[PDB]
Amino acid sequence: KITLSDLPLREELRGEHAYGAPQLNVDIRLNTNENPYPPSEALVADLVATVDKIATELNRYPERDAVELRDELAAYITKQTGVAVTRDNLWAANGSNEILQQLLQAFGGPGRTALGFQPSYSMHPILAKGTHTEFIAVSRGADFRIDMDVALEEIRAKQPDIVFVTTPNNPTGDVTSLDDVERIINVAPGIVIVDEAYAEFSPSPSATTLLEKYPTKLVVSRTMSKAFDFAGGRLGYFVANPAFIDAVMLVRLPYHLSALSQAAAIVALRHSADTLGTVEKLSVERVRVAARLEELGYAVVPSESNFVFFGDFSDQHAAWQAFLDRGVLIRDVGIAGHLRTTIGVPEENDAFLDAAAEIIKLNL
Amino acid sequence: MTKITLSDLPLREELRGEHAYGAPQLNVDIRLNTNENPYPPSEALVADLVATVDKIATELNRYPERDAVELRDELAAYITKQTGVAVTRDNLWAANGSNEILQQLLQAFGGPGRTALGFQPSYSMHPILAKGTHTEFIAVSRGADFRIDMDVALEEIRAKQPDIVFVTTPNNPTGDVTSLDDVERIINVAPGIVIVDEAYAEFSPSPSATTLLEKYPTKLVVSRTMSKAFDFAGGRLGYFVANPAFIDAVMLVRLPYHLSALSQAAAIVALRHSADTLGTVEKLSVERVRVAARLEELGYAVVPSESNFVFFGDFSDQHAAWQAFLDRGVLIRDVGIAGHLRTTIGVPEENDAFLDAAAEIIKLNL
Ligand SMILES: Cc1ncc(COP(=O)(O)O)c(CN)c1O
Ligand SMILES: Cc1ncc(COP(=O)(O)O)c(CN)c1O
């Protein structure tokens, strides 16, 4: 009977734990920023017909460079952001996680550093470590926004190889203005990855509008997992100068994107207008949830995403368990006093708010 | 926008002058270059896949099941049947192709300050993935017969104490199986882990290294794929069989939710049609014998193969020979080995086209 301790694991992996929210089958799941609406019937029927057409070629490797997918991603970005781009500017992988892994491999790695503004997406430092990129944590301000004076000073002092800016931010929900992003890009010596996972939830312009001005520095990361209602499809992408595609082609695993992954995303993309209509509904529920939390007595951080960061508990994890006891699974993001709730359909939000009303009285 | 190229980006130095891996994507009517099973998925498999997608597509807004437990159950059922070795989900791990399986194992057990040892010529992604994961690669030469020279192998493993040893069997590109006794000899001298890459195992009647897992639980990992005999390259599903402790190890390095909902569901569908699909192995194996025999009759040097491809020579310029095949409508693989090319076995009409071309080409003395 052997254990992990008996295998010659890398030392730095000893005592580490596998990443991911608990997979708990409770009634109300508001913990991973998924769009709560199921894919449309029209989208599903299109997917079914598409699989029926392409399934007879599943014995063959997929198209290695995902050209058709990249064409359709470029068409989306051109329409969505107003910045003319083509497949040459687009690159796709298995989730943002793989996009970010590839970028870290090409531009981070041993002897290099990535800088982020904490608290932000927990996979950023995890992926940095996983690629042997040293992570530099710069604190956001007391309002949970980027403190630009500290940000610019620390970038200037550390000269990081990569800077992450997540906007809208996970977990806090705030947008870093494009003017502020420009200030950061200008001091950053290497590349800046602007993680726009939640961009569709904000009416303000995409960092794609800065690509023409900063081609040697700026990569804009996007996903189909959130607003695009397609997390199960595992499709992340970036938009950048075509030089960046050449870069990641050197580190990507050959045929990293399956035939079905490509074909499914293409289908989802041609139903984007209908699917993304859900952003309107979610924004209205975000407003309602945030206002109700404030009415209840909670400290709520303003958000431009599909989630709300709120506090202030003495023991957030106890509060988290108290929601869970009530059938509501939200996210403990490892931040003192605070939890993160995803905006769901109205019935889910009501259940969350009902639980929140009970829980504030427990003074946890 | 200012006009720039890759030279203007702050790329890692070691990546300068590198080239993207992969056979050229040439639209030729006879493609025999990536070791794919040439038979299309069965009507019954496709119908099942279509129905399954109609059922699970309504859940694609959600992240997939992170640990692919059902898939791992069904891979474990397959391996138990296929190799005669009782395993469960606890012994199985899946990823997006063997390539990602190998990447993850290299991350957990290779990496900076560690080494991986291979017997060249073997699968060209072993050293590439090594480099990609900052694992130093040690190339040990196979013998004149393209098989592993065991004296040299055991000597170098003893001398170098590699963190990882790769043994590919059947070997790509040469096709030879390394006997389980020889694999056992390698495992016993290896100090870290040994990854036995059985990508082509289904094509050889010989026993799997899964039969050695009980005896060497702290060292042996057996890598497998659905891309070759399993007729599912487009599904990108690779996996390994090992002691459960290795699942624990790779869970520390795998990207969360690395396997999509459709990838898991499609692989499950494929697995339930395995007996029918893997029936094609019999025809492929006999066509391989026919193809290799004709190449020899024609006058080529052919390495005896137990896989779905044949490695043959001896050209003055194998790239010229490769272009001569291309010119005749037949795409095979230049595996970057002087004098030699590798042809995948196709359907009989494809194999006949390959052999017709080979008969013309030998007369050109290229
Ligand atoms: C900022 C941010 N970026 C990237 C991701 C990852 O998305 P994906 O599903 O595309 O891997 C997330 C959450 N999942 C996120 O919050
Ligand atoms: C020995 C070997 N291992 C692994 C692979 C990769 O297979 P997959 O399609 O599962 O990533 C190949 C493919 N050519 C191979 O020849």
UniProtKB/Swiss-Prot annotation, chain A:
- One GO term (biological process): L-histidine biosynthetic process
**Which domain of life, per UniProt?**
Bacteria
Q: Which reaction does it catalyse?
A: L-histidinol phosphate + 2-oxoglutarate = 3-(imidazol-4-yl)-2-oxopropyl phosphate + L-glutamate
Enzyme Commission number(s) from the entry: 2.6.1.9
Known InterPro entries for this protein? Answer: Aminotransferase_I/II_large, HisP_aminotrans, PyrdxlP-dep_Trfase, PyrdxlP-dep_Trfase_major, PyrdxlP-dep_Trfase_small
- Which pathway does the record list? Amino-acid biosynthesis; L-histidine biosynthesis; L-histidine from 5-phospho-alpha-D-ribose 1-diphosphate: step 7/9
The cross-references to Pfam families, in alphabetical order and at most eight, read: Aminotran_1_2 (PF00155)
Cofactor(s) this protein cannot do without? pyridoxal 5'-phosphate
Provide this UniProt record's keywords sorted from A to Z: Amino-acid biosynthesis, Aminotransferase, Histidine biosynthesis, Pyridoxal phosphate, Transferase
Q: What class of enzyme is it?
A: transferase
Mark the residues carrying the PTM N6-(pyridoxal phosphate)lysine: K226
- Kindly list the GO molecular function terms attached to this UniProt entry: histidinol-phosphate transaminase activity; pyridoxal phosphate binding
Instruction: Give each disulfide bond as a residue pair.
Output: none
Q: What PANTHER family does this protein's entry cite?
A: HISTIDINOL-PHOSPHATE AMINOTRANSFERASE (PTHR42885:SF2), HISTIDINOL-PHOSPHATE AMINOTRANSFERASE-RELATED (PTHR42885)
Tell me the protein family, please. Belongs to the class-II pyridoxal-phosphate-dependent aminotransferase family. Histidinol-phosphate aminotransferase subfamily.
What does the subunit comment say? Homodimer.
Q: What is this protein called?
A: Histidinol-phosphate aminotransferase
Which species is the source of this protein?
Answer: Corynebacterium glutamicum (strain ATCC 13032 / DSM 20300 / JCM 1318 / BCRC 11384 / CCUG 27702 / LMG 3730 / NBRC 12168 / NCIMB 10025 / NRRL B-2784 / 534)
